[PDB]
A paper describes a structure:
Follicle stimulating hormone (FSH) is an essential glycoprotein hormone for human reproduction, which functions are mediated by a G protein-coupled receptor, FSHR. There are three members of glycoprotein hormone receptors, FSHR, LHCGR and TSHR, which are activated to mainly couple the Gs protein and lead to up-regulation of the secondary message cAMP in cells. FSH acts through FSHR, which is mainly expressed in gonads (ovaries in female and testes in male). Here we report cryo-EM structures of FSHR in both inactive and active states, with the active structure bound to FSH and an allosteric agonist compound 21 f.
To obtain stable inactive FSHR proteins for cryo-EM structure determination, a small molecular antagonist, compound 2427, was added during FSHR expression and purification. Through numerous data collection, we were able to obtain a structure of wild type FSHR in the inactive state at a global resolution of 6.01 Å. Due to the relatively low resolution of the inactive FSHR map, we only built a poly-alanine model for the inactive FSHR structure. In the inactive FSHR structure, the ECD conformation is closely titled toward the membrane layer and the TMD conformation is very similar to the inactive β2AR31. Structural comparison of the inactive FSHR with the inactive LHCGR and TSHR structures reveals that all three receptors have a similar ECD down conformation. The ECD of FSHR has a nearly identical position as the LHCGR ECD but a 7°–8° rotation close to the membrane layer relative to the ECD of the inactive TSHR. In contrast, the hinge helix in the inactive FSHR structure shows rare interactions with ECL1 by rotating approximately 30° counter-clockwise relative to the hinge helix from the active FSHR structure, thus confirming that the interactions between hinge helix and ECL1 is critical for FSHR activation.
Numbering used by the authors: 20 to 287, 344 to 643
Write the structure that this text describes.
C-alpha cells in the first residue's frame, strides 16, 4: 500500500500522511494499525466490509476528535479493539459499535470523551473484557450502561477513571465477572441498588477510592475484594452478606482481626493485611505487667515534673540559665508522662475489647493528639539536653567567658526556638506527613509514602546527630575538668557530674529505640512490634522519670529549697 505498510495481511498506517482512512485497504486485511495518524474525524462505516478483520489498533491519534456512528459495525471476526492516546477524542457516536459477536477485548484509554460509549449493540457472544482507563472526562455512570455488551460474562476494567458518582442499576442486565474501579479518587459512595439486576461481580477492586461504605446488597457473589488505600471504607458490611467472599485485600488490619474472631466463632478467608503486634486487637499494652507498670511510671513522672517545676519557680534564689533548662526538661517530661497516662487509660478502658474500639481509637483524634504530644515532648527534651550540653561546654572550655558570651535572654530565645521547632515537628503528622494511626501507640511509624519515610529518617538523623554532639561535648568537658593544668571549680565539678548523669540516662533510654527505629525505617525490622511497644513504654519514659532525681533532687541546693518550701 502506498500510504500504509502491508505484511501478512496486516496494514500499519502511520505518519501524518494518514489524514483519513484509506478506502483502498484490502477487505481481507486481518489487522489494521493506526499510529500517530493525522485523522481528525472517523467517517461513519469506515470499517464496513472488513469481514476478515480480527484486530483494530488506534494509537497516538492526537488530532482525532470525533468518531462517526457504525464505524465498528458488522465485524464478525473483530475480537480485539484498541484505542489509545486519543486525547482530543471528546465525542463518540452512540451507534459506533454494533454487531460484534466475536468481540473479546475493547480497550479505550487516554480519551477525552466525557461519556461512556454505548455498547448495548455489541451483542458479543463470547466473553468481552472492557478496559477503560485514563478517562478523566468521564464522571458519572448511567443506568444500564453495560447492558447488552455481551451475553456471556464480561470483565469491566474501569480503573484510572474520573467517575465521581454511580447511578442505581448501573450494571443491570450484565454478567459482571470482575470489576476494576480502583484509582477513582472522586468515587465517594456507591448506591445500594448499583448491582440490582446484575450478576456478581465476582472480583471487586476498589483500591485507592473514597468509597465511604459498600452496598448492602449484591455482594453475595463477591469472591474477591480489593480495597487497598481505601481509607474512607471505615466500616464494611456484615460478614453474613459476603458469604462467597474467599479473599480480601483491605487497608485496615483491625477489620481483618474482627473477621478472624468471627471465623473462630464460626468454627465453634484469606484477608490481608493480617493483624500484628503493632495494632493489637486484644489490648494495646498486651502484657498485664507492662500495663500495670505504665500507670505507675506515668504517675511518678507527672509528680516528679510537677514537683521540680514548683521548686524551680518558688525558689528564692535567682533563676539561672541552667535553671531554665531544667524547667524546660521537666515540662517535656511532664508532657511525656501525660501522654503515657493517656495511653494507659485508653488501654485500660478497652481491656479485652480493644478490637471493637481499635478503629475508633486509631482513626479518632485521641491517637493523633497522643502522637503529637509524644513527638513534641521528645523533641523538646532533645533540644533542651543539647542546649544544656552546649552551654556547659562553652562555659568549661571557654572559662574566660562565663558561657561563651551567653545571657539569660539568649537562653530564653534558644528555648523558644526549640519549642517552636518541636511544635512544628509534632504538627507534621497532623498535616498528612505520615500518620500516627499506623500503630496503636499513636507512633508516626507510617513510612509507606516517600515523604513520610523521608521525614522519619530526617528526624532520626537529627536525633542521632544531637546525641553524638552531646556525647562529644560531655567527653570534652570531662577531659578538661580532670586536666591538672586547669583549676576546676567545685560548682563546675557538680555541674559536670549532673550533666554526665543526665547524658548517661538519656543515652540508655534512647540508643536502643533509635537503633530499632533506624532499622525499621530501612525495611529491616530486627525486633517485633510487641517488643518495640514494651521498649517504648519502659525505656522512653524511664529517662524522663529519672531526670528529676538525677538532676534536681540529687542537688544539695534543690534539697535545701524543697526543705525550705516544706517548712511553709
Amino acid at each position: 500500500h502506498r500510504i500504509c505498510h502491508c505484511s501478512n495481511r496486516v496494514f500499519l498506517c502511520q505518519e501524518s500522511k494518514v489524514t483519513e482512512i484509506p478506502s483502498d485497504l484490502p477487505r481481507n486485511a486481518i489487522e489494521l494499525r493506526f499510529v500517530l495518524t493525522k485523522l481528525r474525524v472517523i467517517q461513519k462505516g469506515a470499517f464496513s466490509g472488513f469481514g476478515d478483520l480480527e484486530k483494530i489498533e488506534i494509537s497516538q491519534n492526537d488530532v482525532l476528535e470525533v468518531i462517526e456512528a457504525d464505524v465498528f459495525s458488522n465485524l464478525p471476526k473483530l475480537h480485539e479493539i484498541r484505542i489509545e492516546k486519543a486525547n482530543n477524542l471528546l465525542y463518540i457516536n452512540p451507534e459506533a459499535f454494533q454487531n460484534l459477536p466475536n468481540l473479546q477485548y475493547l480497550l479505550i484509554s487516554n480519551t477525552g470523551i466525557k461519556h461512556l460509549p454505548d455498547v448495548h449493540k455489541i451483542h458479543s457472544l463470547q466473553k468481552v473484557l472492557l478496559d477503560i482507563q485514563d478517562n478523566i472526562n468521564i464522571h458519572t455512570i448511567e443506568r444500564n450502561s453495560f447492558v447488552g455488551l455481551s451475553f456471556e460474562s464480561v470483565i469491566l476494567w474501569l480503573n484510572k477513571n474520573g467517575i465521581q458518582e454511580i447511578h442505581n442499576c448501573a450494571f443491570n442486565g450484565t454478567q459482571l465477572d470482575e470489576l476494576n474501579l480502583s484509582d477513582n479518587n472522586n468515587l465517594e459512595e456507591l448506591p445500594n441498588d448499583v448491582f440490582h439486576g446484575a450478576s456478581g461481580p465476582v472480583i471487586l477492586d476498589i483500591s485507592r477510592t473514597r468509597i465511604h461504605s459498600l452496598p448492602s446488597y449484591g455482594l453475595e457473589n463477591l469472591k474477591k475484594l480489593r480495597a487497598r488505600s481505601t481509607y474512607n471504607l471505615k466500616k464494611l458490611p456484615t460478614l453474613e452478606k459476603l458469604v462467597a467472599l474467599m479473599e480480601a485485600s483491605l487497608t485496615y488490619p483491625s477489620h481483618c482481626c474482627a473477621f478472624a474472631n468471627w471465623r473462630r466463632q464460626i468454627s465453634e478467608v484469606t484477608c490481608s493485611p493480617k493483624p500484628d503486634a503493632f495494632n493489637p486487637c486484644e489490648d494495646i499494652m498486651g502484657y498485664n505487667i507492662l500495663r500495670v507498670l505504665i500507670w505507675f511510671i506515668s504517675i511518678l513522672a507527672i509528680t516528679g515534673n510537677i514537683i521540680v517545676l514548683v521548686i524551680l519557680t518558688t525558689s528564692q534564689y535567682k533563676l539561672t540559665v541552667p535553671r531554665f533548662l531544667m524547667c524546660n526538661l521537666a515540662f517535656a517530661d511532664l508532657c511525656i508522662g501525660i501522654y503515657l497516662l493517656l495511653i494507659a487509660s485508653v488501654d485500660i478502658h478497652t481491656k479485652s475489647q480493644y478490637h471493637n474500639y481499635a478503629i475508633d481509637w486509631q482513626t479518632g483524634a485521641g491517637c493523633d493528639a497522643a502522637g503529637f504530644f509524644t513527638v513534641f515532648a521528645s523533641e523538646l527534651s532533645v533540644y533542651t539536653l543539647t542546649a544544656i550540653t552546649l552551654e556547659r561546654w562553652h562555659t568549661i572550655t571557654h572559662a574566660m567567658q562565663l558561657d561563651c558570651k551567653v545571657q539569660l535572654r539568649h537562653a530564653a530565645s534558644v528555648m523558644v526556638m526549640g519549642w517552636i521547632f518541636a511544635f512544628a515537628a509534632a504538627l507534621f503528622p497532623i498535616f498528612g506527613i505520615s500518620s500516627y494511626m499506623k500503630v496503636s501507640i499513636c507512633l508516626p511509624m507510617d513510612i509507606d509514602s516517600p515523604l513520610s519515610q523521608l521525614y522519619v529518617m530526617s528526624l532520626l538523623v537529627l536525633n542521632v546527630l544531637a546525641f553524638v554532639v552531646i556525647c562529644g561535648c560531655y567527653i570534652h568537658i570531662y577531659l578538661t575538668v580532670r586536666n591538672p593544668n586547669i583549676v576546676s571549680s567545685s560548682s563546675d565539678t557538680r555541674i559536670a557530674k549532673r550533666m554526665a548523669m543526665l547524658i548517661f540516662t538519656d543515652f540508655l533510654c534512647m540508643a536502643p529505640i533509635s537503633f530499632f527505629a533506624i532499622s525499621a525505617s530501612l525495611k529491616v525490622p530486627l525486633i517485633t512490634v510487641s517488643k518495640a511497644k514494651i521498649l517504648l513504654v519502659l525505656f522512653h519514659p524511664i529517662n524522663s522519670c529519672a531526670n528529676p532525681f538525677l538532676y534536681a533532687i540529687f542537688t544539695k541546693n534543690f534539697r535545701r529549697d524543697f526543705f525550705i518550701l516544706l517548712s511553709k
